[PDB]
């Protein structure tokens, strides 16, 4: 019995929670007590790790919400809206909801840059935007994707560096200091998820039945193509250590891979097609969101 099977099996019986809408995103706060934000339908639910009911709700109380993502200090949530808005929610519940307008279609991807005071958005208008929070305005637009921009990752370390994935089958790497993408890689299926490793030198792309790992320092050299899912790969996650990659799929499985070998070291089965996957600090909680509106929460033994 491998040390990996021992590690990833070391969870209690799952707790199933009904969200009564497809769970499009789950994100853990990086700050104690590591609450998680659940995006479904037109609102964001906050749960405590052991909550079976939401402890807070954030919403415009309008249209479908997308991609609710904590800032690195756990103090703001950024989200997109169906009507083409980017929203910031103050987690304290003290300050008014802030709205950035400019996108002309649904915004499915938002992230904070490393500096914490800029946002990267991607929309169904095919465009990528860089927003200055303090100046309350767009500073850059990139019109290089030719189809919906459905996923995105700002560098953990570099405030200038960020990536987006598109249904145009490409991932584009952008530097805030230049007006055109620095690199483009052909995932070759519609891109549903991306990950940038902290160095910026390795990028993971997921979509169709494929997970692909790219060396971006080497001009976007393909390191490996993984075909371990039977249906669309919908989500990517790193383990707390950065030493494991997790993928979730409409095929109801989460695969865990070594970041050294890219061999599968564990497999988990879920009741329904997976849309979202999130791991708490030191992997103490694993949350999977599915198409039938149910969250599966696993607590570490």
UniProtKB/Swiss-Prot annotation:
GO cellular component entries: cytoplasm; endoplasmic reticulum; fibrillar center; nucleolus; nucleoplasm; small-subunit processome
Residue windows of the WD repeats: 18-57, 60-99, 102-141, 144-184, 186-224, 228-267, 269-301
Entry's Gene Ontology molecular function annotations: RNA binding
The entry's keywords: Acetylation, Isopeptide bond, Nucleus, Repeat, Ribosome biogenesis, rRNA processing, Transcription, Transcription regulation, Ubl conjugation, WD repeat
Subcellular location: Nucleus, Nucleolus
Keyword Acetylation among record annotations: yes
An example Gene Ontology biological process: rRNA processing
Positions bearing the Glycyl lysine isopeptide (Lys-Gly) (interchain with G-Cter in SUMO2) cross-link: 231
Summary of subunit composition and partner proteins: Part of the small subunit (SSU) processome, composed of more than 70 proteins and the RNA chaperone small nucleolar RNA (snoRNA) U3. May be a component of the proposed t-UTP subcomplex of the ribosomal small subunit (SSU) processome containing at least UTP4, WDR43, HEATR1, UTP15, WDR75. Interacts directly with UTP4 and WDR43.
Function: Ribosome biogenesis factor. Involved in nucleolar processing of pre-18S ribosomal RNA. Required for optimal pre-ribosomal RNA transcription by RNA polymerase I. Part of the small subunit (SSU) processome, first precursor of the small eukaryotic ribosomal subunit. During the assembly of the SSU processome in the nucleolus, many ribosome biogenesis factors, an RNA chaperone and ribosomal proteins associate with the nascent pre-rRNA and work in concert to generate RNA folding, modifications, rearrangements and cleavage as well as targeted degradation of pre-ribosomal RNA by the RNA exosome.
Protein's name according to its UniProt entry: U3 small nucleolar RNA-associated protein 15 homolog
First and last residues shown, out of full length: 19 to 319 of 518
């Amino acid at each position: 019995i491998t040390q990996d099977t021992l590690y990833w099996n070391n969870y209690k019986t799952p707790v199933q929670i009904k969200e009564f809408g497809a769970v499009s995103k789950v994100d853990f706060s990086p700050q104690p007590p590591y609450n998680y934000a659940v995006t479904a339908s037109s609102r964001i639910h906050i749960y405590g790790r052991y909550s079976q009911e939401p402890i807070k709700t954030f919403s415009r109380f309008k249209d479908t919400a997308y991609c609710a993502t904590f800032r690195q200090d756990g103090r703001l949530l950024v989200a997109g809206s169906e009507d083409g808005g980017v929203q910031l929610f103050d987690i304290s519940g003290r300050a008014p909801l802030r709205q950035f307008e400019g996108h002309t279609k649904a915004v499915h991807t938002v992230d904070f840059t490393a500096d914490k005071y800029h946002v990267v958005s991607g929309a169904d208008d095919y465009t990528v935007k860089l927003w200055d929070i303090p100046n309350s305005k767009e500073i850059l637009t990139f019109k290089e994707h030719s189809d919906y921009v459905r996923c995105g990752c700002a560098s953990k370390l570099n405030p200038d560096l960020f990536i987006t994935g598109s249904y145009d089958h490409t991932v584009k790497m952008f530097d805030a200091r230049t007006s055109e993408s620095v690199l483009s890689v052909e995932h070759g299926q519609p891109v549903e998820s991306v990950l940038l490793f902290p160095s910026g030198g390795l990028l993971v792309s997921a979509g169709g039945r494929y997970v692909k790992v790219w060396d971006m320092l080497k001009g976007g050299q393909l390191l490996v193509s993984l075909k371990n899912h039977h249906k669309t790969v919908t989500c990517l996650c790193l383990s707390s250590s950065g030493q494991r990659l997790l993928s979730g799929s409409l095929d109801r499985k989460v695969k865990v891979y070594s970041t050294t070998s890219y061999k599968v070291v564990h497999s988990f089965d879920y009741a329904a097609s997976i849309l979202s996957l999130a791991l708490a600090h030191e992997d103490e909680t694993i949350v999977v969101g599915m198409t039938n509106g149910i969250l599966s929460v696993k607590h570490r033994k």
